Amino acid sequence: ANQLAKDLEIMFENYVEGFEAACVVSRNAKKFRPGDTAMQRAGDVLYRPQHY
Amino acid sequence: HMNIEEGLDLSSKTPTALVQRLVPSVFKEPKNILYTLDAREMRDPEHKTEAG
């Protein structure tokens, strides 16, 4: 044999799939942006009316 | 400021000593105001505006 140099070939831009939380109840729930200056003024609590 | 001396022959008299008096003028310790706003409180811009 003729003794070539070895190297580490690391593909830092390619990732193995890993793990993920499904998030499907959050994906299917209603989403609401109540308004940040108003929520500060309200003390981080908001009220909505129910029907008569 | 000068002494007055009297007569024609002044050989017995001490001449007036010139005293170069100086008046100090100096800065005080700097005067400051401090306030803080947290990342909730900063959602309302009137806090910064009125405190400024």
Automatic annotation (TrEMBL), chain B:
Organism domain of life: Viruses
Protein name: Coat protein
Species of provenance: Enterobacteria phage CUS-3
